[PDB]
Design a binder for this molecule. Structure first.
Ligand code: F43
Ligand SMILES: C[C@@H](OP(=O)(O)O)[C@H](NC(=O)CCCCCCS)C(=O)O
Ligand SMILES: O=S(=O)(O)CCS
Lengths: 247, 560, 220, 429, 431, 56
């Protein structure tokens, strides 16, 4: 078949970007499913998934060829609510960026609704599918507890200068350092959890820079990457020309 | 430029490394990548303390919940310090709150000046009088008629002191005609402009005579912008009837009533489609060229970069804070999508660097003139825009305070794209060249940082590149003509301000007298307006200090 | 008349209860109405480092709810409630409650200054933005998600009652202007029929207000 | 340029049909669909009777107290249909058809095509239908001379006081021409729920009919002159009408466990195999920039891939919400992974950006079902992005709040009784 | 079945016993052809396009783009431009498309095919397709670099899509944009009296006939003629506009040399009494004879015919076009005084006459009767029974108006007067 | 008057009738003509004044 190539760029930032887009990410921590549900905050930990409508089998479906050809996700057969997981990533060498979180979610998961902004990146799907996506995003090197985090509101802090502790700014203070490990104690909308979630040891700054997907003159200058600049120029030239005339 | 880079650095120093109010930000390194967040709450601002006190007092006085910062989710506003804003190219320090258009009197007065102004053609009325009425028009007769118009237009049942900002002036491309007319009613193109600028203005308007009509500001506030044309038409008809000794009631005089009322009436804006239905003289129909012309920076300065930047500042404010911030949206506002392009000199620093780069690579192509300008090609646009964008990105990545200042990605993207487009239009003398440079800057920004802007800031920027040079029906117009009603631009912020500055630059770099409309350049070339269009960005700063006195205030007919 | 708008609360409530699975109780409505009365005059409720309209210049802005549900009006904070039974005679109140049903409505009045610096098309937009933001703040839902759009679409169109409709192209003017304000709406705005019983005085008051509003302002 | 058109079951409809023969201005079936959309209108007899009885007429919240008329319109709906046909029809035996839909609650008035050829636009259908219904009411129910206004406004809403029939009970597929955003946009002004309801929630039927309307409105607006005629016809054939079964082949092959990335791989593989694009340059890091040999064909492939990816994403999730993200990210990652512009050269991608913003924020828009071709958010793609929205809405499962029923119950009930709309691909082929 | 017979402009018989049902806009083939030709025809100003390109005076009133002038010999190549545009606007090689170079290449005349109309909801397909074709032809034939493409596009599509219409563009039809109608069905109106006077070469009866054709087509489009109102409008149109039974030519002939409005009223009431249209319902003690209408639609048709005849008399007598705003008013008012019945259109004609009077005899003169059309706020009221009178008046003027019909409608006169159905509306309508 | 003589609560829209039954309005919609009279004698205080931001 056609082997994806996913991106141009020979630097380490290009390598990380291809990692995130292809999802060939490395495990860095463990988060318990009860902890994951608690931090998300869409339902009580270890409780049955609510339903926004009946199951697909219970109410039947119209005669679509697409419905009969496309296999409904496990979270859609049960009629789960369409909940979200939102992340805020630091510009100061966080290991992920909004558009490449979105590329991860779009290439690697079925029936998701990845939305990308500058300061936050939201992923929406049925509850179980979003649980899977949040599990992958939390247990991999894509997410740094110091330089990332779930934020369902007041996502300010992606472009703000880091703290001396080494962690991004959080207005609501969902998680923070505690004994060398970023401990999360509120759901992603600042509704406190009864438990403390231990997300592990934050990566060293050199490590994050070695595995970040953001170009920076400090670490990996975008100006010195001729291949990505050439990609931009080629796409732009084609856009302009074929806007003038499609030929 | 080094001098502008220096002022950028000084602005960051006065913003972050210096303490404002009670945020305790004194000290720091504007090249440093770490800070500690004190979380002092909205009571660190002092002005915010004023707002909190007033809101609470009103809550007790009226009897319903009014304004409680505690109803901000989580914690109140200001968990990181409240640092001020500095108006680009000046030293007035402004709090963020004072730059919200509701809180800025000059900011309101700008729109109240563009809204209440109209220009009515006058050759056809005189021609009808001469031919089909026998009453030959002589410059004495024009003097008397304009005297009659000048105070009748205020209304004469309008209050004598409530409408003091209501006057009418004339400008003519006929050099010999404007010489006799009483100079209290004449805008003289030959002495408000330079010789070449006035030459182009006269060449473009011909031998024609026009009126600049300004209806009372209170009338414009009470009604909409579509009342201006009707008020002007009625006062014009009254002045014609009462100044030329013509009976009202005969049929033949109705032809003159048409000719003087609305046959050569040029509106600031035009109609809008259904979703945004509005009539003439609203910001959605105001072209980018018309806003370029309302700004008199071209008339009073030879620097092209300064002219383009001043147009950008005013434009963002009119099209983001008023138009999209209030009419289409409302709410808290969009003041900080707009203050990016006229505060803290990041845009000025980038654009002056681009001027230096172009003059160094293309033999001073960014200097004033019309022959040195490089022909607009994809290579030139790619070169200038990319270098501009790369430098702006390097500056954000080299000064963490500049990144924190434009914390939302939309502000940064707007600043970079505005600088790139202005530079490209300066170098090439082509407004659409500036547009294509703008969109290439957006693409470089996106690919470099992995994030561009708010959820839908990329709509007109994905649609941007391809539509710049199309000649299809709903796609493509020279920028000078484009406006907020353009299909791509109709509903998104952070762009339309810079688009106007792009079109102004294409003609500012050539020493042009006007961008798209000479009647606007001369109509607003009058230092009698309560607003100073020669430098608008300095005007917003003046409002933010509570030192701007607008028109349309009702204090005389109100209990004290 | 220009700055005033009415937005229903029942369609947004259905959206919240379906999409999010929330419970909409009177205490949550108290919290949400307090939030909204904070946010409507032009203040932020979600994110940080932004301006806010000065409370002195927008003090004429507030939101109240009147409902044809007697109970739901009963256990809601009586500072945000227009009580039909108290304000109207029992016959008129019965007619009104029969007409509207057991539905809740918001009576939004955006600042005078915002309407003067803008047109009459301003009102629905401002009201919908602040209603959406207040929902977001008060019901602990994400800043951006499909439920927020549904609330915005409900407020902006699906459950909005404009003082006036939009005029045709030839009349170079827009919505919520005096030209869209039909005679029934102008009759209902004038509150003599609620206050007095003289059937001729009511008509004369409506004539006196309509002559001004139409001839002097709309036609100039 | 010759394609095959495949129906939504993946069967072969017609072989080798030339692309130019499939244009809005040349194809007979598309012209008939346009004429029927122009002339057909739907009347809510139940709503008329309710307004008459309760005086609830003239818009939202309006109700005239004390002038209620108690007519049994629903009971005598057959006689009403006969008299409305008598009034509307220009000549006896012409194309004028009036049917009673769904047990008397609603009517279907299809005015004769002569009333279309003898007028500037489609509003003759609406005005004549409303006039016929009002006249029949006044006739058969003996309304007093002074009760005529009430019977009139139980059908006409607030017209002429309002531009459209606000609060009326007669409406058509297309809104009034005064609501256009530009010249020729009237055919584009059909909300997504209308197309979803008309085809009875059939994804590749809603997509086909929506694309038919979009391309008709874009031909009307001077969007297909010269090479752009071929440019748009290729897009219509490939995306809307299932050219050579590419969309349904991709749907089947990426249905069980597919994503956006796998559909991108499918599109790029088919393009590279068919020769629509070939490797132009290879960078030192091994990335191969591609060059489009056939630029309109590559745009058609991008549009077909966009629709297929929307199918896959919104059918795996069973939510019409995901359509905006599918339209954005398919094209965005296609650009990133091939080195070429997305469908409609960033126009579809930007429309997806704006449509994802406005359906995910406080600034308006709404669900995917309230967006149409005339919407200021989505009026930018040249017919390649709204079909995906309509297909997504037809492919939802009870997730939306403003559902198809809520906004277009009458439209669905009335216009789902025309075969040329339930089977748009068969009609066009 | 109401049947009349049509008398042509010079008083000759055209055909006997035409059913007025076969005379409505939705049935007559000539009227349908006129509507289609109005919808599809559009005129391009090549000289204007060339001037816009050279000078940059494009996009609207006062606009000028400096420093971006293109110098193309558009007028010199007009035959080639017309050929290429006909190639671009067609749908098939041999359809009813036609591009003719009018008046020496200064302007183009492009009529889009009927297929472009049938496959679009309204009439703007012809305008947009013609403009796009011209812009494409300019770009192709004069070698415009892609960075000058916006200028070449906006020399045709003046300031669009920023403005709702082509503000300053050099491609214009006869109908305004669909957004700028007064209401539902009003679009097919909005063809000012000057254009109709020009098209018929100032033949007052022909101008009235064509104007009534447009006005009644608009009425039928609006849904104001269904059943008995269809009979009402058909009778009114046939009697007033189309000179059915010669009832208006005879009235004009009888008040030829010495006749005022009052004499026309006497003649029309005499004919109405003789034909049994009205009778003496009462007789007051003063000898007054209140009349009752035996056929209200027919009495309205008679009142409309009399109104047209009175406009003919009182505007040909003075050879002024400003006598309609008083003729239509006072004729109907004095008619109701005389007979005790209501005027033409039951007072709506008199009201619209007051509209003409205050909008054209005042300080709010928005222009003479040459600007009047049925698609205006002031003139939209009467159901097609007044505007024919205004068109007849402007056709009967002697040059007392500031705007000559030529100066404002020469191109429209050339384009449409060349069509038989536009110079001789009555003969084509009579079929 | 068509409905006032009938003692009806509202003319055509009850939502507007109840929406303006608020006493916080600076304008008294119970006595509109009396409000005009008060305005004409310089004894009506309207909102929207910008004296806070305007210089003294
Ligand atoms: C609820 C939304 C979604 C929506 O439709 N509008 C919001 C909120 C809204 C409200 C916030 C006021 C309030 O709290 O009631 C207002 C002021 C609009 C209004 N009603 O007047 C606004 N945004 Ni928003 N919004 C802005 C921006 C942004 C940037 C902020 C990024 C960051 O790191 O802080 C992000 C999107 C992006 O990633 O670019 C953003 C999102 C959001 N924006 C998220 C809130 C995010 C959160 O929970 O933190 N805005 C900006 O980019 C800066 C300017 C700021 C605008 C206020 C001003 O400029 O006047 C404000 C513009
Ligand atoms: C899209 C449309 O919204 P509706 O279709 O009305 O819901 C439109 N919004 C405006 O164009 C956008 C205003 C908000 C802009 C926010 C920054 S992009 C309007 O107000 O009519
Ligand atoms: O959060 S959103 O990007 O959708 C709006 C920010 S103004």
């Amino acid at each position: 078949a056609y082997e994806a190539q996913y991106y141009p760029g020979a630097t380490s930032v290009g390598a990380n970007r291809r990692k995130h887009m292809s999802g060939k990410l490395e495990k860095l921590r463990e988060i318990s499913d009860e902890d994951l549900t608690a931090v998300l905050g869409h339902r009580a930990p270890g409780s049955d998934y609510p339903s926004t409508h009946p199951p697909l089998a219970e109410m039947g479906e119209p005669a679509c060829s697409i419905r009969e050809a496309v296999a409904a996700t496990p979270g859609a057969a049960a009629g789960d609510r369409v909940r979200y997981v939102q992340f805020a990533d630091s510009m100061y060498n966080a290991p992920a960026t909004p558009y490449f979180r979105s590329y991860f979610a779009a290439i690697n998961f079925r029936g998701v609704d990845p939305g990308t902004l500058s300061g936050r990146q939201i992923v929406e799907a049925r509850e179980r599918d979003m649980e899977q996506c949040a599990k992958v995003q939390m247990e991999t090197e894509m997410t740094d507890p110091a330089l990332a985090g779930m934020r369902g509101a007041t996502v300010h802090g992606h472009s703000v200068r880091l703290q001396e502790d080494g962690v991004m700014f959080d207005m609501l203070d969902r998680r923070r350092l505690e004994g060398g490990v970023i401990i999360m104690d509120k759901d992603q909308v600042a509704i406190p959890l009864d438990r403390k979630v231990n997300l592990g040891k934050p990566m060293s700054s050199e490590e994050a820079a070695k595995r970040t997907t953001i170009y920076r003159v400090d670490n990996v200058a975008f100006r010195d990457d001729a291949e990505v600049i050439e990609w931009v120029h080629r796409v732009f030239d084609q856009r302009t020309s074929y806007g003038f005339q499609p030929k | 430029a080094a001098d502008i880079f220096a002022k950028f650095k000084k602005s960051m120093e006065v913003k972050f490394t210096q303490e404002y109010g009670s945020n305790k930000q004194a000290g720091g390194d504007i090249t440093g990548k770490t800070e500690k967040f004190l979380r002092l709450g909205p009571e660190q601002d002092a002005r915010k303390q004023e707002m909190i006190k007033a809101g609470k007092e009103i809550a007790e006085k009226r009897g319903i919940a009014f304004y409680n910062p505690m109803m901000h989710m989580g914690a109140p506003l200001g968990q990181r310090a409240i640092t001020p804003y500095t108006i680009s190219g000046t030293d007035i320090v402004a709090e963020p709150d004072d730059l919200h258009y509701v809180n800025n009197a000059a900011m309101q007065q700008m729109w109240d000046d563009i809204r209440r102004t109209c220009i009515v053609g006058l050759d056809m009325a005189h021609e009808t009088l001469e031919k089909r009425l026998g009453k030959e028009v002589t410059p004495e007769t024009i003097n008397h008629y304009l005297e009659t118009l000048n105070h009748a237009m205020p209304g004469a049942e309008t209050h004598p002191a409530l409408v003091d900002d209501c006057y009418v002036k004339i400008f003519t491309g006929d050099d010999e005609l404007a010489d006799e007319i009483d100079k209290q009613y004449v805008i003289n193109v030959n002495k408000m402009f330079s010789e070449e600028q006035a030459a182009q203005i006269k060449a473009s308007i011909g031998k024609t005579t026009w009126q600049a009509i300004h209806i009372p500001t209170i009338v414009s506030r009470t009604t909409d912008g579509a009342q201006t044309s009707r008020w002007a038409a009625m006062q014009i008809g009254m002045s014609f009837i009462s100044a030329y000794a013509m009976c009202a009631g005969e049929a033949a005089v109705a032809d003159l009533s048409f000719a003087a009322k609305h046959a050569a009436l040029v509106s600031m804006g035009e109609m809008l489609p259904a979703r945004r239905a509005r009539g003439p003289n609203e910001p959605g129909g105001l072209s980018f060229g018309h806003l370029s012309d309302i700004v008199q920076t071209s008339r009073v300065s030879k620097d092209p970069a300064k002219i383009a930047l001043e147009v950008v500042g005013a434009g963002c404010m009119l099209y983001d804070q008023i138009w999209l911030g209030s009419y289409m949206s409302g709410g808290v506002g969009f003041t900080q999508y707009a203050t990016a392009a006229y505060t803290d000199d990041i845009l000025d620093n980038n654009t002056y660097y681009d001027v230096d780069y172009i003059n160094d690579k293309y033999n001073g192509a960014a200097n004033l003139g019309t022959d040195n300008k490089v022909k607009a090609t994809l290579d030139v646009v790619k070169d200038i825009a990319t270098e501009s964008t790369l430098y702006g990105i390097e500056t954000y990545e080299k000064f963490p305070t500049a990144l924190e200042d434009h914390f939302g990605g939309s502000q940064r993207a707007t600043v970079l794209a505005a600088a790139s487009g202005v530079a490209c239009a300066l170098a090439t003398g082509n407004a659409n060249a500036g547009l294509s440079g703008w969109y290439l800057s957006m693409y470089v920004h996106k690919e470099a940082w992995g994030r561009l802007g708010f959820f839908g800031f990329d709509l007109q920027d994905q649609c941007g590149a391809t539509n710049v040079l199309s000649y299809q029906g709903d796609e493509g117009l020279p920028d000078e003509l484009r406006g907020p009603n353009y299909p791509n631009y109709a509903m998104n912020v952070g762009h339309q301000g810079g688009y106007a500055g792009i079109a102004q630059a294409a003609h500012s770099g050539r020493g042009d007298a006007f961008t798209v409309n000479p009647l606007l350049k001369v109509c607003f070339a009058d230092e009698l307006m309560p607003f100073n269009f020669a430098e608008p960005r300095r005007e917003f700063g003046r409002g933010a200090i509570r030192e701007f006195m607008p028109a349309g205030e009702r204090s005389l007919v109100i209990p004290a | 008349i220009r700055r005033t708008c009415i937005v229903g609360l029942d369609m947004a409530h259905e959206t919240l209860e379906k999409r999010l699975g929330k419970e909409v109780t009177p205490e949550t409505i108290n919290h949400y109405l307090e939030t909204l009365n904070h946010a409507m005059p032009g203040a932020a409720v979600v994110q940080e480092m932004m301006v806010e309209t000065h409370p002195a210049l927008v003090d004429d802005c507030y939101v109240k709810i009147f409902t044809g549900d007697d109970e739901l009006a009963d256990e809601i904070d009586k500072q945000y409630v227009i009580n039909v039974n108290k304000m109207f005679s029992e016959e008129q109140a019965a007619q009104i409650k029969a007409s509207i049903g057991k539905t809740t409505w918001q009576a939004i009045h955006i600042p005078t200054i915002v309407s003067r610096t803008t047109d009459g098309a301003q009102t629905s937009r401002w009201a919908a933005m602040q209603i959406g933001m207040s929902f977001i703040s008060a019901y602990a839902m994400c800043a951006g998600e499909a439920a927020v759009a549904d609330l915005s679409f409900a407020a902006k169109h699906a459950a909005l009652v404009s003082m006036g409709e939009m005029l045709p192209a030839r009349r170079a003017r827009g919505p919520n202007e005096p030209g869209g304000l039909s005679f029934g709406h102008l009759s209902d705005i004038v509150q003599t029929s609620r206050v007095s019983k003289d059937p001729a005085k009511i008509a004369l008051e409506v004539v006196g207000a309509g002559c001004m509003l139409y001839d002097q302002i709309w036609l100039g | 340029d010759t394609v095959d058109i495949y129906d939504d079951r993946g069967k072969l409809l017609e072989s080798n049909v030339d692309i130019m023969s499939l244009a809005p201005t040349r194809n007979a079936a598309i012209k008939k669909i346009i004429l029927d959309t122009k002339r057909s209108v739907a009347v809510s007899l139940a709503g008329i009777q309710g307004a008459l009885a309760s005086g609830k007429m003239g818009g939202k919240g309006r109700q005239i107290l004390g002038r209620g008329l108690n007519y049994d319109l629903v009971g005598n709906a057959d006689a009403i249909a006969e008299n409305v046909k008598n009034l509307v029809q220009v000549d006896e035996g012409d194309d004028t058809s009036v049917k009673v839909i769904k047990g008397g609650k609603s009517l279907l008035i299809q005015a004769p095509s002569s009333r279309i050829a003898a007028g500037a636009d489609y509003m003759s259908a609406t005005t004549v239908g409303a006039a016929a219904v009002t006249q029949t009411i006044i006739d058969m129910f003996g309304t007093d001379m002074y009760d005529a206004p009430i019977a009139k406004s139980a059908v006409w809403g607030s017209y002429p006081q309002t531009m459209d029939l606000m609060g009326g009970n007669v409406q058509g597929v297309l809104s009034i021409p005064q609501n256009n955003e530009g010249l020729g946009f009237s055919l584009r002004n059909i909300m997504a729920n209308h197309i979803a309801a008309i085809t009875s929630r059939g994804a590749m039927n809603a997509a086909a009919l929506s694309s038919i309307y979009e391309q008709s409105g874009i031909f009307e607006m001077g969007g297909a002159v010269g090479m752009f005629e071929r440019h748009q016809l290729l897009g219509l054939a490939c995306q809307g009408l299932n050219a050579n079964n590419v969309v349904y082949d991709i749907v089947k092959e990426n249905g069980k466990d597919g994503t956006i990335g796998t559909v991108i791989e499918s599109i790029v593989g088919r393009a590279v195999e068919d020769g629509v694009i070939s490797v132009d340059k290879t960078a030192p890091s091994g990335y191969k920039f591609y060059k489009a040999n056939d630029v309109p064909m590559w745009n058609a492939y991008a549009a077909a891939g966009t629709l297929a990816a929307t199918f896959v994403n919104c059918g795996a999730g069973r939510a019409a919400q995901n359509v905006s993200s599918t339209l954005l990210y398919f094209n965005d990652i296609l650009e990133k992974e091939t080195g070429l512009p997305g469908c409609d050269y960033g126009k579809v991608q930007g429309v997806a950006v704006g449509f994802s913003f406005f359906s995910h924020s406080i600034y308006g828009g709404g669900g995917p079902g309230v967006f149409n071709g005339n919407h200021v958010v989505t009026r930018h793609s040249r017919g390649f992005a709204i079909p995906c929205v309509c297909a997504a809405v037809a492919l939802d499962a009870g997730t939306q709040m403003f559902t198809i029923e809520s906004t277009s119950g009458l439209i669905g009930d009335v216009f789902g009784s025309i075969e040329e709309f339930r089977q748009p691909i068969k009609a066009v082929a």
